[PDB]
């Protein structure tokens, strides 16, 4: 039939980047029309692939990863990059073949009081390997002393909220991101 792409974009809700969502698109033909109606100005950045290859996927298997980060960080959802989203949250390989879709969602994902519902991992001992997902909440030990199950001095609950408000700058504003990959 038709690929369920209106459920990737125009999903009722998007996940935190630390818990990025993967949905398989397996055996269908694609229409990306929904992208014009959600995002007036979006971005469709493909590496090593024509985006016309993402039009026929009747005999191909595609991974759609989706999350919300902020605009300064969309540059980290790209091959060979470093930051806190690439290092600790979502890591693309250096040989990446696929596409990265991004668009401003300040109108759905910001609140005058502040939307604290989206989180990113701030602390980790090692960097994430490509396409890895760490959804743990175990306290991080930044010091030489054990943390004993509790945050405090040099002991950090590893996830932090994003503080998204409409008065923020285009940089500091929530962006929805969708990474298309091949299996």
């Amino acid at each position, epitope marked *: 039939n038709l690929c369920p792409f209106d459920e990737v974009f125009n999903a009722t*809700r*998007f996940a935190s980047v630390y818990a990025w969502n993967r949905k398989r698109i397996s055996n269908c033909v694609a229409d990306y029309s929904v992208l014009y109606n959600l995002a007036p100005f979006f971005t469709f950045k493909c590496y090593g692939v024509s985006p016309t290859k993402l039009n026929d996927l009747c005999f191909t298997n595609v991974y759609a990863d989706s999350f919300v980060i902020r605009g300064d960080e969309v540059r980290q959802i790209a091959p060979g990059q470093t930051g806190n989203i690439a290092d600790y949250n979502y890591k693309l390989p250096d040989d990446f073949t696929g596409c990265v879709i991004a668009w401003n969602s300040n109108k759905l994902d910001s609140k005058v009081s502040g939307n604290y519902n989206y*989180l990113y991992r701030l602390f980790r001992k090692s960097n994430l390997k490509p396409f890895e997902r*760490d959804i743990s*909440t175990e306290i991080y030990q930044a010091g030489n002393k054990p943390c004993n*199950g509790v945050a405090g001095f040099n002991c950090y609950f590893p996830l932090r909220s994003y503080s998204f408000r409409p008065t923020y700058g285009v940089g500091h504003q929530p962006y929805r991101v969708v990474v298309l990959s091949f299996e």
Partner: single-chain antibody, 232 residues
Framework: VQLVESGAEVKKPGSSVKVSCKAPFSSYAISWVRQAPGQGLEWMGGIIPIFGTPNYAQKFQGRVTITADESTSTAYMELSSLRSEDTAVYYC????????????????????WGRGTLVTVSVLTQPPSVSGAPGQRVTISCTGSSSNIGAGYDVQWYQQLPGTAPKLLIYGNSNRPSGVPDRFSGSKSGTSASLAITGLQAEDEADYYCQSYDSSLSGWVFGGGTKLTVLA
């Protein structure tokens, strides 16, 4: 705040119960778990209110229907075609995800448990029994698989004293909630996890259950339960 459930029921074999559960919750996960008399906790299923499709354990797939009504602020479990086996206590549990719950997979802990709705109808491995020396250290093992503990999911531990609902003891793998003394510790390595109690006290004598997410069955799973007994 405390989850308030409907009253006990005596049902004939073949009937259906609809158990209510109210927060006196759109950001939280509702999870339904039962405990047949003398047995461990069983996960029945769960829903994310408003934005969720209900998720069920394969044991209960065609017999259970988990609903949530936003207006009335109540969550419902309807178990149909009852047998004698379904006699148990039915608990509802609220799960925190820090803010809003995308899915039932991302629940950090089920901190607020209900009452018990007792319905009478006319896997992770744990030591069934552990004996401990007072003032000394005991450990309770939780051993899982590469579909759960070893898939990168965290272990929670729960305490059940006689007559009450489980109480959250450690979430994370090792994190103590507020109120839980330092004597309790948690640890996770590979496909196994461990609760430790130091300076054992007669009050620590209770049942302990571990819990994790399993991605191959796409739900929560409980351990068999451990009856810790404090010696003299």
């Amino acid at each position: 705040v405390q989850l308030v459930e409907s009253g006990a029921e005596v049902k004939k074999p073949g009937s259906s119960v609809k158990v209510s559960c109210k927060a006196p919750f759109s950001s939280y996960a509702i999870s339904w778990v039962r405990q047949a008399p003398g047995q461990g906790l069983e996960w029945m299923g769960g829903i994310i209110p408003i934005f969720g499709t209900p998720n069920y354990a394969q044991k209960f797939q065609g017999r259970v229907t988990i609903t949530a009504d936003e207006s009335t602020s109540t969550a419902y479990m309807e178990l149909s075609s009852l047998r004698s086996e379904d006699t148990a206590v039915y608990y509802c549990a609220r799960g925190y995800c820090g803010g809003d719950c995308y899915s039932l997979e991302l629940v950090w802990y089920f901190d607020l448990w209900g009452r018990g709705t007792l319905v009478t109808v006319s896997v992770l491995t744990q030591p069934p029994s552990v004996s401990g020396a007072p003032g000394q250290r005991v450990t309770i093992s939780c051993t899982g698989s590469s579909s759960n503990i070893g898939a990168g999911y965290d272990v929670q531990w729960y305490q059940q004293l006689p007559g009450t609902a489980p109480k959250l003891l450690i979430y994370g793998n090792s994190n103590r909630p507020s109120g839980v003394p330092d004597r309790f510790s948690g640890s996770k390595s590979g496909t196994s996890a461990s609760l430790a109690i130091t300076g054992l006290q007669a009050e620590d004598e209770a049942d302990y259950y571990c819990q994790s997410y399993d991605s191959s069955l796409s739900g929560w799973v409980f351990g068999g339960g451990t009856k810790l007994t404090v010696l003299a």
